[PDB]
Amino acid sequence: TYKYVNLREPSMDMKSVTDRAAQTLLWTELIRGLGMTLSYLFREPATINYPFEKGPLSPRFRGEHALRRYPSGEERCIACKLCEAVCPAQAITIEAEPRADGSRRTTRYDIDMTKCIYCGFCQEACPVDAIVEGPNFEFSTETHEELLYNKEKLLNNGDKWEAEIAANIQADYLYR
Amino acid sequence: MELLQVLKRGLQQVSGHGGLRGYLRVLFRANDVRVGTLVGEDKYGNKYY
Amino acid sequence: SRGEYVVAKLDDLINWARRSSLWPMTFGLACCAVEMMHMAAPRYDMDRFGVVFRASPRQSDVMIVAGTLTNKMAPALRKVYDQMPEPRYVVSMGSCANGGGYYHYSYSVVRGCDRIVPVDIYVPGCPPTAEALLYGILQLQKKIKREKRLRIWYRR
Amino acid sequence: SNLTLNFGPQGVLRLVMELSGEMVRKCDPHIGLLHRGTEKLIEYKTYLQALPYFDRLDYVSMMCNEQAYSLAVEKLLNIQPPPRAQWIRVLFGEITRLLNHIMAVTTHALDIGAMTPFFWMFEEREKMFEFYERVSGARMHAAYVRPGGVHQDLPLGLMDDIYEFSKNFSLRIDELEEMLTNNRIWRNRTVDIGVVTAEDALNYGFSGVMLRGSGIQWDLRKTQPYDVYDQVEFDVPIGSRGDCYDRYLCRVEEMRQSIRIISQCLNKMPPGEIKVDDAKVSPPKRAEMKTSMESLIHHFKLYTEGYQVPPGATYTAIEAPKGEFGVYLVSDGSSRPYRCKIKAPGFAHLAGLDKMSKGHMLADVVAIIGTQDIVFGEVDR
Amino acid sequence: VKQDMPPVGGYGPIDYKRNLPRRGLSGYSMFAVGIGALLFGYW
Amino acid sequence: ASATRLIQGLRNWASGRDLQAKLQLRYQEISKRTQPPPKLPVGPSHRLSNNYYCA
Amino acid sequence: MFMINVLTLIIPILLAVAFLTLVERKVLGYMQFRKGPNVVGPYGLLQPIADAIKLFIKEPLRPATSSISMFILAPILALTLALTMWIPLPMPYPLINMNLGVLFMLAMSSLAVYSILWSGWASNSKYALIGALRAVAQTISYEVTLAIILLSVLLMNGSFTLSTLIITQEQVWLIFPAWPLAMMWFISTLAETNRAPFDLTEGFNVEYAAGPFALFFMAEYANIIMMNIFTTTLFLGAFHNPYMPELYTINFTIKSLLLSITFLWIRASYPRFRYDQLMHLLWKNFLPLTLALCMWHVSLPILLSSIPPQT
Numbered sequence A: 001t002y003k004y005v006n007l008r009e010p011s012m013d014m015k016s017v018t019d020r021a022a023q024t025l026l027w028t029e030l031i032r033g034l035g036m037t038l039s040y041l042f043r044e045p046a047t048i049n050y051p052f053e054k055g056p057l058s059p060r061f062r063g064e065h066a067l068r069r070y071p072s073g074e075e076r077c078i079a080c081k082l083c084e085a086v087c088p089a090q091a092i093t094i095e096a097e098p099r100a101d102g103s104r105r106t107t108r109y110d111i112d113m114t115k116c117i118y119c120g121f122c123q124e125a126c127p128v129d130a131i132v133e134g135p136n137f138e139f140s141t142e143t144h145e146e147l148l149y150n151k152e153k154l155l156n157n158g159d160k161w162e163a164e165i166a167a168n169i170q171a172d173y174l175y176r
Numbered sequence B: 001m002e003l004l005q006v007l008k009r010g011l012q013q014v015s016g017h018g019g020l021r022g023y024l025r026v027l028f029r030a031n032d033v034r035v036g037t038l039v040g041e042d043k044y045g046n047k048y049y
Numbered sequence C: 001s002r003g004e005y006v007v008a009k010l011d012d013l014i015n016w017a018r019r020s021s022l023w024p025m026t027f028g029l030a031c032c033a034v035e036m037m038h039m040a041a042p043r044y045d046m047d048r049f050g051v052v053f054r055a056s057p058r059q060s061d062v063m064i065v066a067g068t069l070t071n072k073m074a075p076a077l078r079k080v081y082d083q084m085p086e087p088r089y090v091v092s093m094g095s096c097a098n099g100g101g102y103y104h105y106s107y108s109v110v111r112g113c114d115r116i117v118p119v120d121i122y123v124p125g126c127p128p129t130a131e132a133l134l135y136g137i138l139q140l141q142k143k144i145k146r147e148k149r150l151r152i153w154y155r156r
Numbered sequence D: 001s002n003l004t005l006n007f008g009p010q011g012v013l014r015l016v017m018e019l020s021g022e023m024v025r026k027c028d029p030h031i032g033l034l035h036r037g038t039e040k041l042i043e044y045k046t047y048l049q050a051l052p053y054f055d056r057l058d059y060v061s062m063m064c065n066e067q068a069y070s071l072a073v074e075k076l077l078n079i080q081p082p083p084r085a086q087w088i089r090v091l092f093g094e095i096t097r098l099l100n101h102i103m104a105v106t107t108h109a110l111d112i113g114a115m116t117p118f119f120w121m122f123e124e125r126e127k128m129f130e131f132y133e134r135v136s137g138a139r140m141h142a143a144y145v146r147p148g149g150v151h152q153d154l155p156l157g158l159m160d161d162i163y164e165f166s167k168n169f170s171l172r173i174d175e176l177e178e179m180l181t182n183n184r185i186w187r188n189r190t191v192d193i194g195v196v197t198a199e200d201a202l203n204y205g206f207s208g209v210m211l212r213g214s215g216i217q218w219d220l221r222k223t224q225p226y227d228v229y230d231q232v233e234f235d236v237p238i239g240s241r242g243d244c245y246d247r248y249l250c251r252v253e254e255m256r257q258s259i260r261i262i263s264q265c266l267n268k269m270p271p272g273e274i275k276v277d278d279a280k281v282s283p284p285k286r287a288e289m290k291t292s293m294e295s296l297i298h299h300f301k302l303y304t305e306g307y308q309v310p311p312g313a314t315y316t317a318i319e320a321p322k323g324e325f326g327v328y329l330v331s332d333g334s335s336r337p338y339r340c341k342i343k344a345p346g347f348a349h350l351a352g353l354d355k356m357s358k359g360h361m362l363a364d365v366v367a368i369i370g371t372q373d374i375v376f377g378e379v380d381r
Numbered sequence E: 001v002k003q004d005m006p007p008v009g010g011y012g013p014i015d016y017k018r019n020l021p022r023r024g025l026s027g028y029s030m031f032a033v034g035i036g037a038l039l040f041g042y043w
Numbered sequence F: 001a002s003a004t005r006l007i008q009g010l011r012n013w014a015s016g017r018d019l020q021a022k023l024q025l026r027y028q029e030i031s032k033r034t035q036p037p038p039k040l041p042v043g044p045s046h047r048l049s050n051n052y053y054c055a
Numbered sequence G: 001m002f003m004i005n006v007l008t009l010i011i012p013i014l015l016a017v018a019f020l021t022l023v024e025r026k027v028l029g030y031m032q033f034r035k036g037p038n039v040v041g042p043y044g045l046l047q048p049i050a051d052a053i054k055l056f057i058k059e060p061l062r063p064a065t066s067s068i069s070m071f072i073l074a075p076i077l078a079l080t081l082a083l084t085m086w087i088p089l090p091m092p093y094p095l096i097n098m099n100l101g102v103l104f105m106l107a108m109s110s111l112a113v114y115s116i117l118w119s120g121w122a123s124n125s126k127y128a129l130i131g132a133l134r135a136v137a138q139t140i141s142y143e144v145t146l147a148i149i150l151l152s153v154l155l156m157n158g159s160f161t162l163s164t165l166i167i168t169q170e171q172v173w174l175i176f177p178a179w180p181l182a183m184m185w186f187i188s189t190l191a192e193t194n195r196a197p198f199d200l201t202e203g204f205n206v207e208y209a210a211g212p213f214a215l216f217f218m219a220e221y222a223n224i225i226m227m228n229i230f231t232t233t234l235f236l237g238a239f240h241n242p243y244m245p246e247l248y249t250i251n252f253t254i255k256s257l258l259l260s261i262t263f264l265w266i267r268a269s270y271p272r273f274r275y276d277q278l279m280h281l282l283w284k285n286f287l288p289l290t291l292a293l294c295m296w297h298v299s300l301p302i303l304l305s306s307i308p309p310q311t
């Protein structure tokens, strides 16, 4: 159940001693290393042509946050505050009140994307699939406060990315 | 000899982008000149191969 | 005018040479260093963009802060930033460099590296993917592309 | 007089060297440059909320530290994962072991000067990060291994790709081993370097390869076994001289034996659920959260309060690729930990750095900091 | 149930051992080739 | 997999190994990115009788 | 007219040094399973130009120097010695055809350590001075085996004439009677130029600005290309038809490029020697074999009646 690495004794006949001296004087394993590097010279490299080629992803990928709507335009979020209760970074801040038709909705839904650890506990705690961590990873900003999303930015992320978010949830919800 | 087929594939990559003009266009915009099956095109002009 | 055209072409030339030859000094603070190393790995391959792998700080063009900036190392970050020659740029990478992240309420964490050094590009993630870091580096190159040093110099 | 150098932070490490010319008389590693106060932040967060901190300790061994914390919480909860979750945990723990040993060997070669197998083996490491992203959605910090099992079942066609990876990965180990093992320059940088006796290795709190390079026959997957390591068949590599070269060979052979374990885990994956079927610990399915009243109450209370862990203290140690990774978890009966001490092997290894670099030279210090696979996230917490 | 499972015949056998192929000539033959190249050059 | 047999033979000679049998670049032998939908099993506690939580 | 010949020597030296950086980044790309630069120019051909313009408009590093004189004269000496090693090189005909071109190149390569020593003392850093003294000691160490191997080969040449070294190899490459000398010469020229696996300076001029550091860099690559051309002439010397010199020019060009690619292919393969290990490599491995082969190559043209001609 165990094996000894590096517990070989070299032979001491004239054959193997001359083999080790030929390896010393003729640099044979160094030529072996040159041969391996020369072998990789004549391979196709693994390099994709970004931005024109993209690395392969899965439908479970956890990128930029978005707030989804029902297929009637009504937003799914009903202010239950499970997502800021489970948020390990406390990146989510929610404030709510009943709006003009009596619906339980949020007035504040903020996600500090610089606090966020992108672990997706908010999408798996959400009982109505409102907050999702969608596919977008190319949302780098030139300013720190541009990574402090309010509810309007997250609803625009949902309206921007719903055509892809709904297909990823369709491909993945049976594992959940 | 199979170097000849390599040269023929390079020349028909030159032929496949619409000639030398489209070849240099994709060479300087993409840094890659290989041809592919046109899968689609969106409402902006992005072409997908 | 003629001189406006000359300084516009000279700005285009020097902006081309400064964005197509970016040399990064990467702070390997925390887990974001692993994904920087994947951005240097053969798949994403920073070197084909002119972005060399592990240049020295006294000749680098961009400081990539990749990982948590603690209180014990914030003067070392500012000192290495001060040793960089101009034009120097700073890319913030991942949540702890951006705003403190998962250690935002910690006693021993600087809450964002922009309390220490001026930051040009904020790359978000935990960690951001190597493709996302490369997106941030290309957005830095586009920011260098629209600089107007000689045009404003001719207009001052 | 004698020389005193400060190899500063220009992970990261400050080193205060007392040299006597070329020799090294004293090596003082000043650390704390990535001390973030993790195990104080754990005290104000629930057990599920404290789980993603363990991803970021040994940030090249993510699912291993997830597994150690999950085993600590499941030990205090007196519940056990289902068998399929156990085989998935051992499978991704050995994939994590391949990740960590590629990082270890290729950066240990990069710092010495062999910069090429770095690029050769990070493509394989890129493919294993695609396996992590397919199983959990993030490439490094998955938050996948949870107390009760894992978070989500394997997507269909993942095991065929783990097969296609494992079939070809031994040739990658062979060409790494072609570049470095018989290489005379690599042997001249690692043979006489940092010889650790077995008694001082037991005394200094060393663990893993740092013991097994010195001939101590100790592996926690054999002696104190966890999830299904008593059901897989593998060998434990043992060194002979306690140096950097034997520890290199032990890590290459642990990549070999991890490939063996991954083949056995692909051939022996059982059917069944992946969480514990106690819905007071692991959350119910989303289809039954949205239909059952008990399951909605349990979803609400687990994702807001969390499960209450019974009061007690445990030290749960697993065999992470850097060695014995331990969690001393103290629970006061609430849904948040009272205390979580995180034992990591690199802390005791970097404590023994000063003995290991006595009588050596300055360019041997980088070889000794390489043979102890030191990730400063796990050292400084 | 439809679950991620290995196929019924299992997976194929997976290499996990060292294969350093032991190529090259013998040491006697390598010294013979080198000394013969010396003799050709000297002549 | 696109290399001609001269370059392929030079590559297999320089490495000394049969590299086309074990290529580190992935091709059509991988799983499909679109999968048929699963049906995950229930656990042992999904029962309607003899399933008291106190046991 | 002669000034045109001097400029057509020394300007394509600087152009070939500019594109050796591109060839190095591409070859170490494809040998490390990746690509080299291919975005900046078409196939990356504008990478040296973009690199040079980036280095030449960078802010000066503004050093506090122990000397002004040595801090300015070290790049000037480095570039001057890097350009004057090319003038006796037969390619098939040299710019300055001289009787003692081999000894000339050995002398002007021995003078190149003053750039390292002056640039190390002209920095206020003590670590830069230690690294510069270690680099100087390495270089003067391997100059010994350069001189003795060079002497043993010129025992088969007949004189110190570099153009006679093409006549010497008309029937056979001189790598055949002198392949241990050739392999120790190759590793010794690898250890002259601080090239990997002997590059301890990358594992001495950290106070120079980006411009003068590029000047040291381009003097170093002029030395690399020059020593590969000199090794090509001295061990793998090509056929020379006097009526068509382009045959020998194309032939030694292809061999010199393959030998420079062999430098790039060695730096992508090996870890660095520790300092005392390559001191052990010189003084205890290369030097005894070099002395024994020097005795052999003295006594061998006498015992075979193959003493080469004096003229």
Ligand SMILES: CCCCCCCCCCCCCCCCCC(=O)OC[C@H](COP(=O)([O-])OCC[N+](C)(C)C)OC(=O)CCCCCCCCCCCCCCCCC
Pocket (backbone or CB within 6 Å): A024, A025, A026, A027, A030, A031, A034, D184, E031, E034, G180, G182, G183, G184, G186, G187, G197, G231, G235, G266, G270, G281, G285, G286, G289
């Ligand atoms: C010019 C064109 C190219 C020329 C060839 C060069 C290209 C090949 C380069 C390969 C990569 C090299 C990278 C750097 C390697 C540096 C390390 C190294 O090799 O160290 C040298 C190593 C050092 O030894 P070592 O470190 O490997 O071994 C241990 C050494 N001790 C015991 C001291 C600890 O070997 C040598 O020094 C040998 C030098 C060449 C010897 C040539 C001998 C020829 C045969 C003579 C006859 C022998 C038989 C007996 C007598 C018979 C009489 C009839």
Ligand SMILES: CCCCCCCCCCCCCCCCCC(=O)OC[C@H](COP(=O)(O)OCCN)OC(=O)CCCCCCCCCCCCCCCCC
Pocket (backbone or CB within 6 Å): B028, B029, B030, C006, C009, C010, C012, C013, C016, G018, G039, G040, G046, G048, G049, G052, G053
């Ligand atoms: C009075 C009128 C004249 C005034 C003086 C000017 C004289 C001429 C000076 C040179 C040319 C100046 C213009 C420079 C380019 C301006 C346009 C530009 O920047 O185009 C960008 C384009 C690349 O586009 P990019 O955004 O990189 O797209 C990436 C694709 N994925 O870029 C390209 O496609 C390539 C850009 C190449 C730039 C020119 C070549 C470099 C300069 C050569 C001469 C100077 C250096 C000489 C050698 C130095 C030492 C080695």
Ligand SMILES: CCCCCCCCCCCCCCCCCC(=O)OC[C@H](COP(=O)(O)OCCN)OC(=O)CCCCCCCCCCCCCCCCC
Pocket (backbone or CB within 6 Å): B028, G015, G041, G042, G045, G046, G049
């Ligand atoms: C011994 C020989 C040594 C040779 C050394 C050099 C080798 C490489 C030579 C270059 C190879 C080809 C380079 C082509 C570069 C790309 C040119 C180009 O198209 O640039 C586009 C850019 C912007 O154009 P724009 O107006 O935006 O057009 C968009 C259209 N919708 O427009 C521009 O950038 C403006 C045009 C700039 C052209 C610069 C070309 C490169 C100059 C390099 C300097 C050296 C030249 C050779 C000298 C020695 C030989 C004579």
Ligand SMILES: CCCCCCCCCCCCCCCCCC(=O)OC[C@H](COP(=O)(O)OCCN)OC(=O)CCCCCCCCCCCCCCCCC
Pocket (backbone or CB within 6 Å): G073, G076, G077, G080, G081, G084, G097, G098, G099, G100, G101, G104
């Ligand atoms: C710190 C200051 C600045 C440093 C940078 C600049 C200086 C260092 C770099 C340049 C070094 C210059 C070396 C000058 C002499 C080189 C040796 C030499 O001339 O050998 C060639 C040749 C002998 O061969 P032969 O064939 O016999 O002559 C033709 C007869 N058929 O001999 C001849 O053909 C003789 C030709 C006439 C004599 C030439 C003398 C040149 C001027 C004197 C040296 C100038 C430099 C002084 C400083 C040196 C470095 C400190």
Ligand code: SF4
Pocket (backbone or CB within 6 Å): A083, A086, A087, A088, A089, A090, A091, A092, A111, A115, A116, A117, A118, A119, A120, A121, A122, A123, A133
């Ligand atoms: S992904 Fe995690 S850290 Fe980010 S908002 Fe959601 S729960 Fe919070």
Ligand code: SF4
Pocket (backbone or CB within 6 Å): A076, A077, A078, A079, A080, A081, A082, A083, A084, A094, A122, A125, A126, A127, A128, A129, A130, A131
């Ligand atoms: S996003 Fe979901 S979890 Fe958060 S408050 Fe809204 S409904 Fe609740």
Ligand code: SF4
Pocket (backbone or CB within 6 Å): C030, C031, C032, C033, C066, C067, C068, C093, C094, C095, C096, C097, C101, C102, C125, C126, C127, C128, D056, D059, D141
């Ligand atoms: S933002 Fe997160 S993953 Fe990134 S370095 Fe910080 S702790 Fe690690």
